[PDB]
Amino acid sequence: VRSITLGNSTITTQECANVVVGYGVWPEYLKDNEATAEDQPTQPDVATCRFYTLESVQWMKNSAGWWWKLPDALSQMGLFGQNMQYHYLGRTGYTIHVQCNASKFHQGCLLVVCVPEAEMGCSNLNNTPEFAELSGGDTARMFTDTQIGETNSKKVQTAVWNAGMGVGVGNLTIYPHQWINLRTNNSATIVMPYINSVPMDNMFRHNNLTLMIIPFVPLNYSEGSSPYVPITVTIAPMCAEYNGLRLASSQ
Amino acid sequence: YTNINYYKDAASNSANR
Amino acid sequence: YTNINYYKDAASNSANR
Amino acid sequence: YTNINYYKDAASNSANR
Amino acid sequence: YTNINYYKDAASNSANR
Amino acid sequence: YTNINYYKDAASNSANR
Amino acid sequence: YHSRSESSIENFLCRAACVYYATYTNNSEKGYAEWVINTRQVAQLRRKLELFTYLRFDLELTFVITSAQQPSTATSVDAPVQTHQIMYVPPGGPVPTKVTDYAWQTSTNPSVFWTEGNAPPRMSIPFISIGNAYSCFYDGWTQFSRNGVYGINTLNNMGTLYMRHVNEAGQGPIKSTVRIYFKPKHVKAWVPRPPRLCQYEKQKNVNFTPTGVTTTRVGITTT
Amino acid sequence: GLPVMTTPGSTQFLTSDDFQSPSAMPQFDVTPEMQIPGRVNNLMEIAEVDSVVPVNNTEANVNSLKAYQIPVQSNSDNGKQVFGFPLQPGANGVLNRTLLGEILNYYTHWSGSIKLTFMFCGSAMATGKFLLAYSPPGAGVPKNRKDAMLGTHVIWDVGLQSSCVLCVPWISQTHYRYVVEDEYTAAGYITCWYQTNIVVPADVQSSCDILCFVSACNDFSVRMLKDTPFIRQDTFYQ
Amino acid sequence: GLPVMTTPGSTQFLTSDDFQSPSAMPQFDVTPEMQIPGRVNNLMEIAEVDSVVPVNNTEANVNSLKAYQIPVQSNSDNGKQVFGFPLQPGANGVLNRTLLGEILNYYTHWSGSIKLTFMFCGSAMATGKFLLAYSPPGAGVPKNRKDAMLGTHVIWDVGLQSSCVLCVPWISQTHYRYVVEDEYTAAGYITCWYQTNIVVPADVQSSCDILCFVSACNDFSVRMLKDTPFIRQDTFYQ
Amino acid sequence: FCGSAMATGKFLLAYSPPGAGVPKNRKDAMLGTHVIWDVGLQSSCVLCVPWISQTHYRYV
Ligand SMILES: CCCCCCCCCCCCCCCC(=O)O
């Protein structure tokens, strides 16, 4: 009923899908009065502000959850990643669209939440997690229903009930979020603005956002129903801006 | 001075006389 | 200052000079 | 007194209440 | 302050400058 | 207070800010 | 008909909290104390600040300095009142290496001299971040290669405090403790975050050991 | 100089005082302010955000997401109890660690209505009616649906609404209640009962789950700031 | 007297306070003021004056004027690098001891563009083109002219201009950078490359020298006064 | 979509202009013009392929 078009890509939702807008702030380009970099910014628009679909994950009956780090997850997506590589600074919003369809004979509930500055804890108390453990680019990193042992030197403490941040998982609703209840909805759409303490930042050294999908009520169905229920995440940068054009970074 | 409240809270005021 | 009573009681005042 | 800033810097002011 | 006599006697005043 | 010179000499004043 | 004045961010944070205390004795050339300024070494103020992602405030600093007489062998110890010096060294400035160091000239570094028996020393500090707000959390690295230091510690470059006895040592050693109190004022907060549930483990990161979400009860109907 | 007389309280350091102090960095030029989303002006704004309630806080569920799942199924009887907990937002484990409960533990007194939301997370083919009741104190907890329905209650039909928002009214002898447990300020009990039954077709799982959310209403307030009992220390963190 | 109450900070001596004090010489008649040339009102005026940059700061050149001389000659190849140094005006030896660097070491934060001027000091018969480039951080230093030209750069022709003024723009995530070295506030690199070649007639020395000057632009500022690390002492000077 | 009314599903319909090959996976396909079709919401999706050519006309 409702179609959202960005660039040459289009997604469709129900006319009453109730899009969640961040903290009530729509993404916007950086204003002159709050900019510090002096060079003229690059605004690729249609080439970068479009829906990119990541790899799908399977919602299993014992699934604990998944997470993606936002700027890193799109680091290899078309011209967005190229601009990231060729520019020192960048800022952008996002439109996160999570898709999970199932029959009326299925049940389950997911929490889709966007967490700004989701600093994560390490299984070894004396260390910090490595980049491979903190992010997998397009690939999703998985929460665990058990506790990671202290032997592991540089892994993320992935216990779901603490959400890798030493907090209460049920209190994650303070961050912009939407519930995917299979009884009522099959998708969630969260539009998030650029949130940082500085007007622009380096897109490789700093992950501004983290998208978490956590099943609060496990998926269930009777024998005969389709057992394979994927979850597909589609993300579109909004008002992407870049500064400091130079040679491409290796990473 | 004669009478000036130095604090923003009413409980800080002197007695009612 | 020059002359301001700081207290609500007359006995607190300075001498009559 | 009631409210007078004694310093030239805003950080010297009391809390916003 | 700038200049206010706090005492009732002239001998209490500061120097003539 | 806000700004009142308490002394008769200019050298006694606070800094020029 | 009920006001929410006491739940304001100002009232919630504008209360003095001890952030650290250091000790130093007057019986050696190394008889000074240092502290790298940070708000993450105490549980209470850290948890209060970490309810938010970004903060912007001025700071009121108050020091509580106390001394204790150390054992001595001289008969009739009679020490005069003690004077202390606290010097702030911004990053890059020369640091003292001994009590009688030349750096204590504090020609440009801000310093405060205070004598025992008086009211606690107190000064105000503005918002001194290079960014537009203080950061409580930082999901990133300091190096562009994503190696090395990860976390909030990358943004901590606030300097160091140095403390010493001004008085020359007498006939008996004196050990002094200085307690540092922070009071945010004119506070602005953004991006509320879930309150910290697991106990803190380290100063420079968010590391934790998993703990249950709540305390338990016998059954779902127990009252 | 001007004659003055020092009063009691001179030279004292009271942690909640409000005075001016000299600046250690005169004429410091602060970084310009920048618009950041999500400005917060009052902790009540945090307390008014719904958080998932761990109603199933048994010893085997607190270290997983099962603590938040309220079981529900098709029964062969009538008027069975689904759950029940005291209305102790600051002292009871059920509500202690939610957003509202965490804000409450920084204070000593509280007053106002509590918004309870229940979302049914079964299949779309399932039907059922539930009785959600709030019983003011003075008697015990209700022991059956007949006792429960004598107080404040609402009938929730999962077939018509997947989410029911029950606003527990403020009924107290005092304007405020203590955050800590105190019998003089008992607030009552919240219970849920089967109004008819869970009914499902063939090839649909009869066992479903309900999620409960809690948040403060618009009339909520707190008083007497205090240190929380949830964080503690033994030595400085290095 | 008037009732007063002393607050914390009483009797303290803060070195950056601003109070009035009694004069020890009442009614002293100061010498009349006289107009002297070169009045200075702000240290930024000193920081805005060009000073010669010791780009050739090798161990064998720092005790002579060779430290300021940048060698240049006619080559048999293309795109060779002339020089390269990090843009660290307060922490790198290349810019540490200039006028700008000396002003910077009295402060903790800095912000603004940097004016770099290069003056060719060869014979009037010499010709040549150079590529002066500024590379923002995130990648390494450029390793060839191809990498260098992808960032901000200008082409300098010594045959047309004996002096090229390159104004390095301010490109940072933060409003200010630390004076001390800190990777979080890396500013990038400045490099120079042969665009074509140095070409001279017969009987002209092919080896020439380039002098580099540095100064702050009009948008430069500093914050957080501190003691410089360049002067120290062991005892009083007699 | 001519399945049962109980069926659900999402599809990615993509049009790739020439110059490269045919897309070989969904990742390649989604980089061009595309729309997401949900059979559970719409039994009929109308995709209008735009005219993108160097010439005003193409040979039959
Ligand atoms: C004698 C003069 C003393 C001057 C002391 C200056 C203290 C520096 C200011 C420290 C601000 C700390 C801000 C904390 C930021 C955060 O929340 O992470």
Alpha-carbon torsion, ordered I151, I157, I158, I159, to 10 deg: 180
User: Which one of I110, I131, I144, I173 makes the best mutation probe of the A interface by having the most chain A beta carbons within 10 Å?
Assistant: I173
Q: How far apart are CA A160 and CA G61, in angstroms?
A: 40
* Sequence letter at residue G208: F
Burial class of H39 by CB neighbour count within 10 A (0 to 12, 13 to 18, 19+)? middle
Which chain F residues are closer than 8 Å to I19 by Cβ? 14
Those chains having 3 or more beta-carbon pairs within 8 angstroms of chain F are D, E, H, I
Tell me the HSE value of A51 on the side-chain side, using a 13 A CA sphere.
Answer: 28
Instruction: Return d(Cα A173, Cα G193) in angstroms, integer.
Output: 10
Bridge partners for G88 per DSSP: G161
Cβ–Cβ contact F6 with I under 8 A: yes
DSSP three-state, residue H58: coil
| Residue A90, helix vs strand vs coil | strand
Atom number in ligand 1 closest to CA G111: 1
Q: Residue I218 carries which DSSP code?
A: T
What CA–CA distance (Å, rounded) separates A240 from B10? 53
Give just the sign of the alpha carbon dihedral I115, I120, I124, I126: negative
DSSP class per residue in chain G: ----GGGBHHHHH-S-EEEEEEEEESSSTT-EEEEE--S-SSHHHHHHHTTEEEEEEEEEEEEEEEEEEPP--SSS--PPPPEEEEEEE-TTS----STT-GGGG-SSS-EEEEETTSPPPEEEE----SSSSEES---BBSSTTS-S-BSGGGG----EEEEEE-SPP-SS-EEEEEEEEEEEEEEEEEEE-PPP-SPP--SSS-------SS---SSTT--
Method: cryo-EM
Helix (H) / strand (E) element for A133: namely helix A131-134
Tell me if F8 and I26 make a contact (CB, 8 A cut-off): yes
Pairwise CA distance, residues I86 & I141, whole Å? 8
Neighbours of F2 (CB within 10 A): 8
In whole angstroms, give the CA distance from residue A71 to residue A81.
Answer: 9
For A122, the 3-state DSSP assignment is: strand
Neighbours of B16 (CB within 10 A): 4
Q: Does H4 touch chain E (CB under 8 A)?
A: no
- Note the Cα A113 to chain centre separation in Å: 8
Q: Which H or E run contains I147?
A: helix I145-148
Best D7, D13, D14, D16 residue to mutate vs chain G (most G CBs within 10 Å): D16
Q: Do the chains contact at D9 and G14, CB–CB below 8 Å?
A: no
CA of G59 to the centre of ligand 1 (A): 7
Asked if G108 is an interface residue toward chain H (Cβ–Cβ < 8 A), one would say: no
Contact H51, A171 (CB under 8 A): yes
List the structure tokens of A190. 């969260």
User: From ligand 1's centre to the CA of I137, what distance in Å?
Assistant: 29
The DSSP-derived string for chain J is --S-TT---EEEEEE--BTB----SHHHHTTSEEEEEETTT-S----------SSS----
Chain E nearest-CA distance from H95, in A, is: 59
> Is I26 touching F (CB cutoff 8 A)?
yes
> Which amino acid makes up residue H194?
Y
How far is residue A182 from each of residues A39, A108, A109, A179, G66, measured CA to CA in Å?
Answer: 48, 6, 6, 9, 64
How is residue A49 written in tokens?
């502000």
DSSP A225-239: B----EEEEEEEEEE
Beta strands in chain A (DSSP E): 2-6, 9-13, 20-21, 52-53, 57-58, 66-69, 87-99, 107-116, 141-142, 177-181, 187-192, 209-220, 230-245
Amino acid identity at I180: V
What letter represents residue G47's amino acid?
R
Amino acid at A142: M
What residues of chain I lie within 8 A of the CB of F1, using their CB? Answer: none
- Select from H95, H113, H223, H90 the least CA-distant residue to H171: H113
Strands A20-21 and A187-192: parallel
Q: Classify the C-alpha dihedral I210-I216-I219-I220 as positive or negative.
A: positive
CB H198 within 8 Å of CB H80: no
**What is the C-alpha separation between I106 and I228, in angstroms, rounded?**
5
User: Cβ(J8)–Cβ(A185) under 8 Å?
Assistant: no
Question: Given the DSSP bridges, would you call strands A9-13 and J33-38 parallel, antiparallel or unpaired?
Answer: parallel
Rounded alpha-carbon distances, angstroms, from residue E16 to A124, E3, G180, H48: 78, 12, 48, 69
**CA separation for the pair G49, G27 (Å, rounded):** 38
Q: Tell me if residue I127 falls in helix, strand or coil.
A: strand
Rounded to a whole number of angstroms, the CA Rg of chain D reads 8
Contacts 24+ apart (CB under 8 A), J39-45: J39/J1, J39/J3, J39/J7, J39/J8, J39/J9, J39/J10, J39/J11, J40/A101, J40/A186, J40/J7, J40/J8, J40/J9, J40/J10, J41/A1, J41/A12, J41/A13, J41/A14, J42/A1, J42/A12, J43/J1, J44/J1, J45/J13
Structure tokens at H76: 């062969």
Q: How many CB pairs under 8 A join E and F?
A: 6
DSSP H11-57: T---TT------BSSTT--PPPP---S-EE-BHHHHHTS-EE-----
Residue E10: phi, psi to the nearest 5?
A: -65, -30
Helix (H) or strand (E) holding I81, with range, is strand I81-86
**Best interface-test mutation with F: which of I18, I20, I28 has the largest number of F CBs within 10 A?**
I20
Closest CA to I196 of I29, I26, I82: I82
DSSP-assigned beta bridge partners for residue H155: H131
H104 within 8 A of H110, measured Cβ to Cβ: yes
* Partner residues linked to A109 by β-bridges: A181, A217
Number of helical (H) and strand (E) elements in chain A, helices listed first: 3, 13
* Distances, alpha carbon A142 to alpha carbons A82, A100, A133, A134, in Å: 27, 17, 10, 10
